Design a protein around this nucleic acid. Structure first.
Lengths: 47, 78
RNA sequence: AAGCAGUAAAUGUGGAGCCGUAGCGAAAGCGAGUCUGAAUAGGGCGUUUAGUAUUUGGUCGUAGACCCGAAACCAGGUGAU
RNA sequence: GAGGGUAGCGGAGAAAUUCCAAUCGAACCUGGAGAUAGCUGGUUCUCUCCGAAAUAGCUUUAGGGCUAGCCUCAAGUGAUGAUUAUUGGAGGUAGAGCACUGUUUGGACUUCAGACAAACUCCGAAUGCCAAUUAAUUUAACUUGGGAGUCAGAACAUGGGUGAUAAGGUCCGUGUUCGAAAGGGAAACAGCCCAGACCACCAGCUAAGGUCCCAAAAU
RNA sequence: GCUGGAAGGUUAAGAGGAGUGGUUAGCUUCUGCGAAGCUACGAAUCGAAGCCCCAGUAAACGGCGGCCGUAACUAUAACGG
RNA sequence: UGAUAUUGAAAUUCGGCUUUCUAACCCGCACCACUUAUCGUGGUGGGAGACAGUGUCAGGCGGGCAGUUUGACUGGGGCGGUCGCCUCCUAAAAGGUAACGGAGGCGCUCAAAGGUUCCCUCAGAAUGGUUGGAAAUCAUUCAUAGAGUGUAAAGGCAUAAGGGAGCUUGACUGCGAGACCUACAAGUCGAGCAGGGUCGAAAGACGGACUUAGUGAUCCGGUGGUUCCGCAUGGAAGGGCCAUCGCUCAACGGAUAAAAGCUACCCCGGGGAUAACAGGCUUAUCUCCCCCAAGAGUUCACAUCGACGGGGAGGUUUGGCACCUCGAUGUCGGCUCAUCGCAUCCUGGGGCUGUAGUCGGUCCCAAGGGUUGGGCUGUUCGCCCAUUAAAGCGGUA
RNA sequence: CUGGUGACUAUAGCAAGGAGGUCACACCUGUUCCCAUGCCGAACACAGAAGUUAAGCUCCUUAGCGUCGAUGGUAGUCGAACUUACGUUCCGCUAGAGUAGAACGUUGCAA
């Protein structure tokens, strides 16, 4: 099923995003490399 | 006795927005369309919905693109 | 303005109070500039910066609000000639 | 027959919504009270200038309302308004055609002849529309404030859907008139043809339509 | 619907107070602890009837069906699927 | 129905279940007195007893009773159907354009089906082969799209927007000249500037998907962050700002957190803006009249009958529309036999005949007069009995 | 005048007949190296003795298909009048036929 999640910055100041995901194909939390607003650089975003 | 029809969507006001031989501002819309019935020429770009818009101040001309095709361009005449 | 003095007057006196002379921001706040924003970078609202008191006319609001007209509801009484 | 009892959020009823002072699916009187009424009816003196709408959107909305469109008054800008001539352009209707998608007739043996189409197109008008900073004629247009009414429209011609190529039928597009328009013609006859009444005259020329008599003018 | 029953489940007020937060007498990181009071919440546990359940009752409310073959009944089915 | 106050004294059992007792409380129980009264009060005997009755708090049942709701469109209303969004046609070559007009979809999916850089060209046909359609993989020739493009349709796409590989996460942050659309609220496109980046040798491209559908104001409530405020001061409760979550509010600009029926017992305010009777327009339906002539008719189309097809008249039927009438135009059958039309039932005059005569059939002229009584049924209509020269069809609200 | 790179609606196209080569173009051998295959030096990328007009590319003819295309007439239609299907006046298709048509032209290395 389709569900929405939030990506939070890892080990740094939190800069949140929102997206969607298919739970069957991706049972685990997704990880991406997004820009952090209050750190001024790309960091790792979990969940 | 009843009807299965009756439905329609709101009309989208497509077509030409500026006339040949007219002076337009920096980012004026020139033509709304679905797909590519007219191609962008000199100093003219495509939007995400195929909208053609100008990128300078100048006079707009509709042109011909080989055979069965046509394009529109803007020329910076003062 | 209330009050006080005056013929139930006119107008004396009375400066609590009100509008204007400066805006922007949710607020702390800053100020001809302020908010957003890392950054007048761009953008929004301001820098016009002449008002104020009484009154004729038009319209609006609160009071029945241009006039006449119900079927009904509630409260207290009068009736078994 | 006389004297008494049961009172309205009640009483009585061998039962009919029947009776409780000529009234009862809930008695009468006085108060809240000038209840509420998106609904009918009515609204009192005179001249001058201008002069509509019966549409769109949304609506517990459909004979109601709000914003926009159309009218009027005051101030401001001022050529930005209208018609025609010239040039340029976007857009596939009428017609036509079978190259695509479907339909179809007769001969051959994939091809030659012949036809049909709102949701077919190898093609393609007349008109209408957007512009120029290009000429001649004309008189509007835009902005800010005060006050509105309108949201039931009708007929004629024409382009279409619906119906039955029926309706003084119904629903859209485009012009005119009535609405809010008197006068002449069509016998009479809001919507058809001509033509827009400031006032007075026992003056002249015309339009539509007419000139044997009614009845003005050619037997 | 009514009557009787209690094996289990759900079930209020009222009792109970495991823990948590606010404040500050004292410490030192030099913006982390923190006893006593007062104060905002409190969970496990106990808690009736009812309901979910078991049985009876129809002169209680109510209900009392279809397709398909077959002669010692020619048409029809006594009888059977 | 349970807890608690009135409510007390003793004693068994895992402060409580459970048992006795009397003083609270109760008796429309007996006797005495006030008192000629047994309403009341007092006294004395019995009965019951910390129960019952009464106060406060809590759970359950409760049309017995009360206040309200029960949508709109609609060729009258009711029943049926539809309500928000997307694509094509009607739509009259700019845009816009209605009808319970003609056709279909949506309330999602994708972690690569996104970004970037390189490379490639489809469908269909014949030929020869383990022969399942030579079309299940194979190699040729022909082939400008008839192939594919997540999903409906339209418009585009072979520069490919189509197919395959390598790297990657721009499906980023703050914004934004200008413009389309438009009553408002909303919706759509957007060059460029700054901060981070990915791919590419570089110029460059990248703010999701070839485009257009996949969505819901405000109030209130939850979860994170924060240069904010915090009612004598310092904190904290509680607010503000930023991010985000919860509605088939689908009658989809959403009345409230919460809502169905009958009225022939009915009432008031309006409307011919809207139906039932009659008038008016039309003639699908109805009733009559013709055109053609394959045929039937012992031969022979037309004495008589007239298949398949075609053209009219009337306004007596059932309907269509909704133009007058809702401050009222009384609706079926009967009594009455008045008045009119001719498409003539009898009488009067004729042509043809498959007319021997007596009867007939069909067509033309003709409206002067005439055109019965009963049984059944409220009936119109219809069946029947007995007659007659004949027992005609229609109009007149 | 052979080659490189741009602009023009096939009047540039397709098809058939003919001429030619080591300046240039092109076919050709090979996989040691940078590179590569669902497998295959076919392709791509490289090292290059010689060898061929056979094939691509350019050259002359070709109206056999494709493309272009007048004139006259017709259909349709703006406007005007009569009336309901006919005049008058502008504009002007489609199809078909007469016809072009075997391309014209820019900047530079040489030749």
């Amino acid at each position: 099923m389709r569900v929405n999640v939030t990506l939070a910055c890892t080990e740094c100041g939190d800069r949140n995003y929102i997206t969607t995901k298919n739970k069957r194909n991706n049972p685990e939390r997704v990880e991406m490399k997004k820009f952090c607003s209050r750190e001024n650089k790309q960091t790792l975003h979990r969940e | 006795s009843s009807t299965k029809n009756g439905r329609d969507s709101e009309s989208k006001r497509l077509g030409a927005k500026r006339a040949d031989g007219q002076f337009v501002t920096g980012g004026s819309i020139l033509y709304r369309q679905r797909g590519t019935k007219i191609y962008p020429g000199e100093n003219v770009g495509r939007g995400g919905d195929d909208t053609l818009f100008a990128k300078i101040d100048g006079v707009v001309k509709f042109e011909r693109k080989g055979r069965d095709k046509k394009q529109v361009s803007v020329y910076a005449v003062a």
